[PDB]
Every structure is written in structure tokens, then in C-alpha cells.
Enzyme design. Structure first.
Site, PDB file in Angstrom:
ATOM      1  CD  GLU A  19      -4.011   9.538   2.987  1.00 16.78           C
ATOM      2  OE1 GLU A  19      -3.626   9.435   4.160  1.00 16.78           O
ATOM      3  OE2 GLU A  19      -4.683   8.648   2.414  1.00 16.78           O
ATOM      4  CG  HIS A  45      -0.738   8.543   1.910  1.00 17.16           C
ATOM      5  ND1 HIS A  45      -1.488   7.385   1.943  1.00 17.16           N
ATOM      6  CD2 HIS A  45      -0.335   8.775   3.175  1.00 17.16           C
ATOM      7  CE1 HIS A  45      -1.582   6.963   3.189  1.00 17.16           C
ATOM      8  NE2 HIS A  45      -0.886   7.787   3.949  1.00 17.16           N
ATOM      9  CG  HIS A  60       3.238   5.838   5.662  1.00  9.86           C
ATOM     10  ND1 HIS A  60       3.021   5.728   7.018  1.00  9.86           N
ATOM     11  CD2 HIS A  60       2.160   6.463   5.152  1.00  9.86           C
ATOM     12  CE1 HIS A  60       1.840   6.225   7.306  1.00  9.86           C
ATOM     13  NE2 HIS A  60       1.293   6.651   6.184  1.00  9.86           N
ATOM     14  CB  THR A  67      -5.942   7.919   5.849  1.00  6.80           C
ATOM     15  OG1 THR A  67      -4.607   7.490   5.655  1.00  6.80           O
ATOM     16  CG2 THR A  67      -5.977   9.210   6.656  1.00  6.80           C
ATOM     17  CB  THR A  68      -5.205   2.493   5.188  1.00  7.52           C
ATOM     18  OG1 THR A  68      -4.250   2.616   6.249  1.00  7.52           O
ATOM     19  CG2 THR A  68      -4.644   3.176   3.959  1.00  7.52           C
ATOM     20  CG  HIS A  84      -1.685  -1.221   1.449  1.00  7.64           C
ATOM     21  ND1 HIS A  84      -2.700  -1.633   0.612  1.00  7.64           N
ATOM     22  CD2 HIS A  84      -1.575  -2.170   2.412  1.00  7.64           C
ATOM     23  CE1 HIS A  84      -3.205  -2.772   1.061  1.00  7.64           C
ATOM     24  NE2 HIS A  84      -2.535  -3.123   2.147  1.00  7.64           N
TER      25      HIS A  84
END
Ligand SMILES: CC(C)Cc1ccc([C@@H](C)C(=O)O)cc1
Ligand SMILES: [Zn+2]
Length: 258
Positions: free
Chosen positions: A104, A94, A92, A196-197, A62
Site C-alpha cells: 500500500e 496486503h 494482516h 486504508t479500507t 478482504h
């Protein structure tokens, strides 16, 4: 569990296995800069990373995570809206398929090219798995990325991505200094939200920095060569691994600055 970011398993599907996806404090959100209010009760933010011990970098299918030794108070976040001490466990990103999308959080509906999340857990709960079951379990520092000049402190990350192209690959990643990923200013917005996941737990104090960092087109292009798939599976480029903005509902976004 088969969730992801595609048409058939992406954010619009997650609620069927994770009903909290339609909950009361979901993330990310749009930050309306005209409605966010300065809060003089916010204490100064304290990012203490000088003893951080990075260990490994992992492609988890992901995103990619840079993991830290969190068995002691080595790299901690304190202050701001926070009570107590939060230990850095991983960071991490996005990011998007194009420079006009990827973050995000959004700022007055603006999308940045990417967003860095430095994840910390509240030491009062003893371990990360217990902390995510608590409303004040995590504190996440969010930093926007825009494309322009290169970020020197990011290059050591960019140059190892070749070795973790596919899901389940990892590589040693010691002696990395996360202080090199911060902007100059620590001015921030803060609100209560969620992962958010999946599993989308409502356990996060979000601290989103106002000042983006600049990365180069070559740096973000290397993010976009990673794969969601495992080795020896059909290639799916790891791009657009972001959840869109969710309803703010009964929440106020507070600013640390005038
Ligand atoms: C198994 C779960 C708990 C891993 C996970 C860690 C952090 C996040 C949020 C805060 C994020 O930074 O995207 C989401 C998922
Ligand atoms: Zn994240």
C-alpha cells in the site's frame, strides 16, 4: 456495503459511500525518501510483544486477520511519535497478484510484494471502537515484504491458510509470536493518516519500517490461493487487496534515522 478491490467496487468507487476517501489525511502515501526529514524529537520506538496472546485467524473477505487478546496490556507499542500506550489487536497483510505490486505504501514509487500491518489502539479511549473515532486512536506498524529467502516466523501463518480459504472461515491460532515477523532494524518513517479500507477513518499514526522482511515465493504464493468469496460461491482469488497511494496534501513524513 459491497466494497472490494474489483473494477466495479474498488478504490475508485469508495468515495461514493465514504466521502472521507477524498479527505485531507488519507492513506497509504508514497514515501519520498529525499523529502522525508529526520526528526530528532522522535523518542525511541518500543515494541513489547513478549506477552502477546494470539487467539484466532479469520478470512474476512478482504484479507486474513490474526487476532490477539487485547483485554489487557499484553502486547503494546509505545514510544517513537506516540504519546501513551497502544495495544495490539490484530495483524494482516496486503499483497499482489505478482511480485512487483502488493504494498500500500510505496518508497520513491517502488511497490513491494506485500505489506504487513500490526494494528494497535490507544488505551486512553477504552476500546477499539472508541479509538477509531479519534485522530490519535490507532498506531499501525507497517512492514514491507520482498520475495527472496523464506521468513521462518511466517510459516506457521502460511500453513494454516488452507483452513480459512473462504470468507467467514476462522481457525484457532494460539501461541503465535509476532516478534518473528519483524526486521532487524526498527528505523521508520511516520505520518498521520487513515484506515486504508472503508470506513477510511482518519485515526491512524502510521509507523512504516524502512527495512523490509524477506519471504519466499512459496510463502506469498500461498497468500494468493485464498479467496475473497465465501464457500460455495464463484471463486475469486484474494490478490491485489491494496489501495494505491493517496495525495499527501498538508502533511510531512518524518524519519527516525539519518
Ligand atoms: C473496521 C475497521 C476499523 C477494520 C480496520 C482496521 C485497520 C485498518 C488499517 C489501519 C490497516 O491496517 O489496513 C483498516 C480497517
Ligand atoms: Zn492493512
Amino acid at each position: 456495503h459491497h466494497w472490494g478491490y474489483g473494477k466495479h467496487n474498488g478504490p475508485e468507487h469508495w468515495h461514493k459511500d465514504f466521502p472521507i476517501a477524498k479527505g485531507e489525511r488519507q492513506s497509504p502515501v508514497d514515501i519520498d525518501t529525499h523529502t522525508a526529514k529526520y526528526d530528532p524529537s522522535l523518542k525511541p520506538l518500543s515494541v513489547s510483544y513478549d506477552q502477546a496472546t494470539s487467539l484466532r485467524i479469520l478470512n474476512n473477505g478482504h484479507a486474513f486477520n490474526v487476532e490477539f487478546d487485547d483485554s489487557q496490556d499484553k502486547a503494546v507499542l509505545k514510544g517513537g511519535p506516540l504519546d501513551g500506550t497502544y495495544r495490539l489487536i490484530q495483524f494482516h497483510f496486503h499483497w499482489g497478484s505478482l511480485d512487483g505490486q502488493g504494498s500500500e505504501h510505496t518508497v520513491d514509487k517502488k511497490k513491494y510484494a506485500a505489506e504487513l500491518h500490526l494494528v494497535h489502539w490507544n488505551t486512553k479511549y477504552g476500546d477499539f471502537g472508541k479509538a477509531v473515532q479519534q485522530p490519535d486512536g490507532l498506531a499501525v506498524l507497517g512492514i514491507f515484504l520482498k520475495v527472496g529467502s523464506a521468513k521462518p516466523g511466517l510459516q506457521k501463518v502460511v500453513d494454516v491458510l488452507d483452513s480459512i480459504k473462504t470468507k467467514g472461515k476462522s481457525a484457532d491460532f494460539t501461541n503465535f509470536d509476532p516478534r518473528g515477523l519483524l526486521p532487524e532494524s526498527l528505523d521508520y518513517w511516520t505520518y498521520p493518516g487513515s484506515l486504508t479500507t472503508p470506513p477510511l477513518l482518519e485515526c491512524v499514526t502510521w509507523i512504516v519500517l524502512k527495512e523490509p522482511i524477506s519471504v519466499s515465493s512459496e510463502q506469498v504464493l500461498k497468500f494468493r490461493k485464498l479467496n475473497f468469496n465465501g464457500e460455495g460461491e464463484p471463486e475469486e482469488l484474494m490478490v491485489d487487496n491494496w489501495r494505491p497511494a493517496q495525495p499527501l496534501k498538508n502533511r510531512q513524513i518524518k524519519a527516525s534515522f539519518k
